[PDB]
Amino acid sequence: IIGGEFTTIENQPWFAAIYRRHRGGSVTYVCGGSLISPCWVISATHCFIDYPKKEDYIVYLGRSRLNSNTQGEMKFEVENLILHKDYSADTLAHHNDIALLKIRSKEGRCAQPSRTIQTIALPSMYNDPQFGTSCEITGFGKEQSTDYLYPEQLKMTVVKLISHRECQQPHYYGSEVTTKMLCAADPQWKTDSCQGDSGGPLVCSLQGRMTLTGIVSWGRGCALKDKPGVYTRVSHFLPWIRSHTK
Ligand SMILES: COc1ccc2ccc(C(=N)N)cc2c1-c1cnn(S(C)(=O)=O)c1
Numbered sequence: 001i002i003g004g005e006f007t008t009i010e011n012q013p014w015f016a017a018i019y020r021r022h023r024g025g026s027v028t029y030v031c032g033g034s035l036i037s038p039c040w041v042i043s044a045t046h047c048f049i050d051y052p053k054k055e056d057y058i059v060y061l062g063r064s065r066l067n068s069n070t071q072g073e074m075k076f077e078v079e080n081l082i083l084h085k086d087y088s089a090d091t092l093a094h095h096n097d098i099a100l101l102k103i104r105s106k107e108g109r110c111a112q113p114s115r116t117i118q119t120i121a122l123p124s125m126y127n128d129p130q131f132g133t134s135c136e137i138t139g140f141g142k143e144q145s146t147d148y149l150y151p152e153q154l155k156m157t158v159v160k161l162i163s164h165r166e167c168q169q170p171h172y173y174g175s176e177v178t179t180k181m182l183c184a185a186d187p188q189w190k191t192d193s194c195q196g197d198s199g200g201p202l203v204c205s206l207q208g209r210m211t212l213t214g215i216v217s218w219g220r221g222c223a224l225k226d227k228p229g230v231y232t233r234v235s236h237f238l239p240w241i242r243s244h245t246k
């Protein structure tokens with residue numbers, strides 16, 4: 001996250017921290033995710049497509065720091081890694097960038113809701129917030145495009161939704177951004193998601209309810225003029241989510 005502010009997991013209790021175990025024992029941060037039910041985490045397929053082996057991944061809930069065992073956190077293994085069958089990546093645009101992770105503790109149990117571990121509601125079909133709506137993003141991603149390290153403390157920021165017709169303008173993304181994607185940015189281009197924030201949530205308050213409207217997917221640079229953050233529009237994928245969580 002470029003700009004914005006540091007936060008803790010009690011502010012974003014649906015946030016999942018996803019890590020990968022390498023040969024030799026080293027563990028590195030991969031992507032963010034969101035808890036949509038006790039046994040299920042939703043993320044982005046591009047996070048796992050090059051290493052699609054479920055045994056490689058570690059999922060944490062109730063974790064606020066990149067290398068601290070936050071009080072009340074829960075550690076899980078991936079029982080089932082579900083990638084979208086028609087996923088593909090162009091020079092910029094990522095298609096069907098959505099994945100599901102069935103989580104299980106070493107004792108065989110799913111998440112236990114608490115003050116730091118909570119689910120996030122899914123949107124209803126054909127009901128996305130109007131363009132201009134302010135929404136929040138969360139992640140352990142880069143603070144600056146030139147950084148190579150991720151921040152130790154979890155971050156958050158607020159961006160505004162951008163219409164499909166504006167996002168399709170020639171100086172924006174043209175025909176590369178589709179109706180299955182949602183654009184969001186800062187009007188002053190000072191804050192945004194970046195590398196490391198992928199798979200994480202775009203949460204919008206819609207008709208009084210906190211909703212998982214988007215999943216961090218792609219963008220040209222980070223906080224670059226006329227180049228919004230692009231997110232998987234979760235409302236389009238409700239039939240796919242329901243079928244694969246059964
Ligand atoms: C693999 O990098 C990624 C990966 C995912 C991204 C998701 C969203 C955005 C965004 N602008 N909201 C940027 C991203 C970049 C990304 C795009 N450019 N850069 S950088 C660090 O400037 O080279 C990082």
Ligand code: NA
Nearest residue numbers: 065066067152
């Ligand atoms: Na840390």
